[PDB]
Each structure stands twice: as structure tokens, then as C-alpha cells.
Design a protein around this ligand. Structure first.
Ligand SMILES: *[C]1O[C]([C][O])[C](O[C]2O[C]([C][O])[C](O3[C]4O[C]([C][O])[C]([O])[C]([O])[C@]43[O])[C]([O])[C]2[N]C([C])=O)[C]([O])[C]1[N]C([C])=O
Lengths: 433, 106, 49
């Protein structure tokens, strides 16, 4: 038989669920989630790295002219100049005065080291969800990893769990993304064509090792000076090397909901949002009968003292009569008070550790088909900040109608019956007529 | 490659606000963020002796200074004087702990 | 004498042979290979003042 449960998706939080079946011992189970992740389905657009300006030798022709046949290459740029007088170490290079020409050619290419460092922009689509749970119910406690797709099921000792669907698609991502060595960023990177020179990725490559590429480096050439043989080339400096300095604030720090981002592969783990549903189907190895467990009565329990902690700082001792020694499991039946000790061995006395800091929890606890109630007062703590998350899920900050709302019954108000007496004076004034 | 760790920061724990005072030997970086749906966050460069006052709501606050592990902090519940001590200290005790509803109630 | 601010160490005079200190000193374990000793504390706040 299968039934539902809601598990609050926060790491370390304990949750209790109860199975009910007429004729057997009541059983409960404790669940605690540890590992989560959201692998997003990434595709590729293009990568970018630093560029380089390969400049071959400037072939000079004296009293002649050349003709530069082009090349299928990125931004192959040809320039032919007249009126040069190259003046090298050996006097002049050639001997002519008016027909001299100089040829300067240069191109822009992907640098040799960015096979190991590079940025890669991805398009970013919907993700998935995996979980790790602890399934302690006294009988042997297993750990489990499983998906949240619903179809995927994993069973221990004939007892199976299914998880999906999910409660929310609250993503710590966007549609467009860019990944560096250890960070992820969200800026709307330009398309494959728009190589704005000096912005992000003015060089683009569709993979690590494609033999074709694209560049818009903004490259031009100028005529040399008197004497010096060189290649004056004007260029916008790198945009990629600019982006390394002119962009702080990655998503690793700006991440919502306190989740944690880790690269290789791109994943976000231990997010804290929404709940997860779970349907569980039991087996008959620990689903124990009624006429075997302790059958007690006159559950003369009580409380001891209570604090407004965030951890186990509410202690409640509870007494009872032992009919036969064994173990029985306890469980709350309202949302105000959680318990820590799942199973207490019924022998003489007992003591439980409840945790609820809202005001003054009046909560019903139960042990082996038996119902009682407890109530106390609680003082606030003295500290201000601690090093562990909450343990009371209670937004139920109201005290539930006791020990501070008694003044409502005090200041009810009363006097409406006096106006009933006044309308009785109306009844006695109409008797004459 | 090795890298120097930075000295510790002793926190001082006020109501909903935690103050951590740095003694940097080198110029370093401070980073912190809230934990809730609303991502309120900042980061700062630190050069000399200076205090920084970061908020702490109930949803939690993480921060990391230098090359350390990221550290977490959480307001415990709230603090006040005497709760349910009979005369009107109940409304004073509910002057903490989301007070706006209490004002419209009174 | 909260460490780092003024008055991190003190003594009644130049010769009071016991002295107060709250310099937050703690020592950790070394990494493998080299023999040394690590230890961490806030620097001498007097020079900061
Ligand atoms: C089953 O059941 C149980 C209950 O009792 C549980 O538990 C508890 O838990 C906890 C958590 O984990 C533990 O703890 C551990 O250990 C470790 C080692 O190292 C440490 O570190 C930590 O801290 C802690 O302490 C304990 O132990 C326990 N208890 C008992 C067992 O008794 C569990 O978990 C379950 N499961 C299994 C498998 O066992």
C-alpha cells in the first residue's frame, strides 16, 4: 500500500511521517535529505580566447611593383605603398629612387595557448533534480540516491519510494550563460556574427579545434617612416583580455536562495526552496502486528522545561506503566512540535527532546495507540546568532489559545445582556398600549 | 601554488545585525550575501582596520573572508525582555517578531 | 583586552612578573615534508594604534 508525504527540501532538517493500519503496531519513519543538484541541459554556441597578430616578412621590391593574390584566411589584409627609401645597415637596401614599392601583409589568428584556457558561452535550458535521503525507521537505516522524475524508483527490502513530480522550477540560471574556469555569469553575449571589436569575444570559434574561425579585430595598416623597415599596424587591443579585468561579480556569489554553484560540470547543489512529494509502498518485514508490541495505558506523562532555541532545548519527561518490556515509537500529531527521539524503549520512565520556539507549544504526543497532551512555558534564549540552521518549521507563532490568550476570555466584554435587559424594558413599555 | 591565509575575524552578535572587525595584514576581499528569495548582497575591498556591519535575517547569511571556507550565521530566534510577564509585556514581547501585525491588532 | 585594539597586553608596571593577554593565539598543524610550526593570531595592535 502506497501513501503520500511532504519533505521540506532543506539539508539537515528532520521530518516524521506516520503510517496507520487497523490491527498492527503503529509505525513512523524519519527522513532527512542531504545531497541535491540541478544539472541544466546545456548546448553550445561558441568559445573565445585571446588572439595573435602573425606578421610575415615585408617583401620590398625596388623599382618594380608586386601584386598580392589573396588567401582564404581570416582578415588577410594587403597593402602596397610607393615612395619608400629603406635604409638598412648596408647603406640602402636597393639602388633606385622613384619606383620603389613595399609590400606589408598581416593576418589575425587564434593564439596557441588557449587550448587550455578559454571562455565558453552556452545556451541554458531546463534542468533536472536528484536527491539523497536517509530513511531511518529503526530497522536498518539505509542511504539512497534517486531522481525526482517519478518513473525512477529504488526499493530497499521490498519497500519502494517514488519522488516526482517536483514542486517548482525555480532556477538559479537564465537562458544565456557563459562559463570560465570556475565561474558562471549572466550577460547577453553577442551572436555568432556581431563581432563588436573590443567587447566580449571579438574572436569566436565553434569548438576547440575547428580549422575555421571568425574575427573582427579592427585591423589596419600604415606607411612606414624614413629609414626603418617594419610593419606599422593599428589595432584595437584585446577584448577578451579586457573582460578578465573589467568584470567582477560572478553568479557564484550573487546566487539566490543560498545555493552553491560548482563547475565541471555546471551544477548547483544544496539549494533550499520548495518541498518534494514522496509516495512510498511498504513491505511486510517491519510492518509489525498489534498483539506483539507493548500494550500500555494510563499514560501519566508531563513536561519539564522549555527554551526558544533552534536546536534541542525542550525537554519533556513522560511516565507510563510497563506491561511488557520492548520498544515503542513516538510521533507528534500537530505541526507545532517536532521530536528528535524516534523510538524510546519502554522501561520505567522516558524522556523526549522536543523543539519548538514559537511561544509555548501545547502539543499532543503519542506512544503505541495512546493519546495525551502536554503544555509548558518557554523563555527566549540569550544569544543572537548561532552556527546551524533552524529545526522548528513553525510559522505557527501563535501560542494556540493558552497561557497568553487567557486575557481574551477575561476581556470578552459582557454587557450585551444589559441591552437585552433594555429591550425587556421595551417589552414592558409596550404592554400599556 | 601557495597563498597566505588571513587572520581571523572576531564577530560580535547584535540584534539582527552581526559586526565583524578585520585586521588585514595585506589588502584582501570581503564577500557576503543573504540567503532568502531576495538576494541582497555586497562585497568590499579592505585595506586597514575597519568594521563592517552585515545584516542577519531569519533566512540566514553566508560570508567568506580571504581564502577561508564560507561561514554561515543565523539569528537565533529574536530577543526581548520579559515574555508573558503579566502586564502588557506580552505586547512588548510581540514588538519583536514581525511587529506590524501586532500594531494593527492593538 | 579584546585582541587587535588598544590594550591587548598590559601589566601594572615594568616588572609585574605576570601579565594579562588575550591575543587570540592558536596554532595549527604543519604541512608534510618541511619542519616548522604554524600559528595564527591578530598582529600586535599597539603598532596599529
Ligand atoms: C540509523 O539511526 C541512527 C539513530 O540512532 C542514526 O544516527 C545517529 O546519527 C548520527 C549522524 O551521523 C551519528 O553520528 C555520527 O558518527 C560520525 C562518525 O564520524 C560522527 O562524525 C558524527 O558527528 C555522528 O556522531 C550517530 O553515531 C548515530 N547514532 C547511532 C548510530 O547510535 C544513523 O545515522 C542511522 N543510520 C545508520 C547507517 O546507522
Amino acid at each position: 500500500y502506497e501513501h503520500t508525504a511532504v519533505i521540506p527540501n532543506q539539508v539537515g532538517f528532520p521530518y516524521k511521517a506516520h503510517v496507520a493500519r487497523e490491527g498492527y503496531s503503529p509505525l513512523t519513519l524519519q527522513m532527512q535529505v542531504v545531497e541535491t543538484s540541478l544539472e541544466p541541459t546545456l548546448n553550445l554556441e561558441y568559445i573565445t580566447c585571446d588572439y595573435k597578430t602573425k606578421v610575415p616578412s615585408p617583401y620590398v621590391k625596388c623599382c618594380g611593383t608586386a601584386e598580392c593574390r589573396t588567401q582564404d584566411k581570416p582578415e588577410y589584409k594587403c597593402a602596397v605603398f610607393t615612395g619608400v627609401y629603406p635604409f638598412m645597415w648596408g647603406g640602402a637596401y636597393c639602388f633606385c629612387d622613384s619606383e620603389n614599392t613595399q609590400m606589408s601583409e598581416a593576418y589575425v589568428e587564434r593564439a596557441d595557448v588557449c587550448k587550455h584556457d578559454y571562455a565558453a558561452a552556452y545556451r541554458a535550458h531546463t534542468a533536472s533534480l536528484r536527491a539523497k535521503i536517509k530513511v531511518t525507521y529503526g530497522t536498518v537505516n539505509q542511504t539512497v540516491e534517486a531522481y525526482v522524475n517519478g518513473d525512477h524508483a529504488v526499493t530497499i527490502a521490498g519497500t519502494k519510494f517514488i519522488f516526482g513530480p517536483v514542486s517548482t522550477a525555480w532556477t538559479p540560471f537564465d537562458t544565456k550563460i557563459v562559463v570560465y574556469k570556475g565561474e558562471v555569469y549572466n550577460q547577453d553575449f553577442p551572436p555568432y556574427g556581431a563581432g563588436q571589436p573590443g567587447r566580449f569575444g571579438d574572436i569566436q570559434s565553434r569548438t576547440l579545434d575547428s580549422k575555421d574561425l571568425y574575427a573582427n579585430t579592427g585591423l589596419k595598416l600604415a606607411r612606414p617612416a624614413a629609414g626603418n623597415i617594419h610593419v606599422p599596424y593599428t589595432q584595437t587591443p584585446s577584448g577578451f583580455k579586457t573582460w578578465q579585468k573589467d568584470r567582477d561579480s560572478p553568479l557564484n556569489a550573487k546566487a539566490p536562495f543560498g545555493c552553491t554553484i560548482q563547475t565541471n560540470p555546471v551544477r548547483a547543489m544544496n539549494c533550499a526552496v520548495g518541498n518534494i512529494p514522496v509516495s512510498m509502498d511498504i513491505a511486510d518485514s517491519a510492518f509489525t502486528r498489534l498483539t506483539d508490541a507493548p500494550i500500555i495505558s494510563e499514560l501519566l506523562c508531563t513536561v519539564s522545561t522549555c527554551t526558544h532555541s533552534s536546536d534541542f532545548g525542550g525537554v519533556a519527561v513522560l511516565s507510563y506503566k510497563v506491561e511488557k518490556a520492548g520498544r515503542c515509537d513516538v510521533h507528534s500529531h500537530s505541526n507545532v512540535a517536532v521530536l528528535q527521539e524516534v523510538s524510546i524503549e519502554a522501561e520505567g520512565r522516558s524522556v523526549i527532546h522536543f523543539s519548538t520556539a514559537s511561544a509555548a507549544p501545547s502539543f499532543i504526543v503519542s506512544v503505541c495507540s495512546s493519546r495525551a497532551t502536554c503544555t509548558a512555558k518557554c523563555e527566549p534564549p540569550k544569544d543572537h546568532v548561532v552556527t546551524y540552521p533552524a529545526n522548528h518549521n513553525g510559522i505557527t507563532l501563535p501560542d494556540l489559545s493558552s497561557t497568553a490568550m487567557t486575557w481574551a476570555q477575561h476581556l470578552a466584554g459582557g454587557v450585551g445582556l444589559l441591552i437585552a435587559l433594555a429591550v425587556l424594558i421595551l417589552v414592558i413599555v409596550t404592554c400599556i398600549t | 601554488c601557495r597563498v597566505p591565509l588571513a587572520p581571523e575575524a572576531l564577530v560580535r552578535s547584535g540584534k539582527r545585525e552581526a559586526t565583524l572587525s578585520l585586521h588585514p595584514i595585506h589588502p584582501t576581499l570581503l564577500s557576503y550575501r543573504t540567503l532568502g528569495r531576495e538576494p541582497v548582497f555586497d562585497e568590499q575591498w579592505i585595506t586597514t582596520q575597519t568594521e563592517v556591519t552585515i545584516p542577519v535575517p531569519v533566512e540566514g547569511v553566508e560570508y567568506r573572508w580571504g581564502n577561508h571556507k564560507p561561514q554561515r550565521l543565523w539569528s537565533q530566534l529574536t530577543t526581548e525582555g520579559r515574555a508573558h510577564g503579566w502586564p502588557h509585556e506580552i505586547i512588548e514581547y510581540y514588538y519583536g517578531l514581525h511587529p506590524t501585525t501586532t500594531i494593527v491588532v492593538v
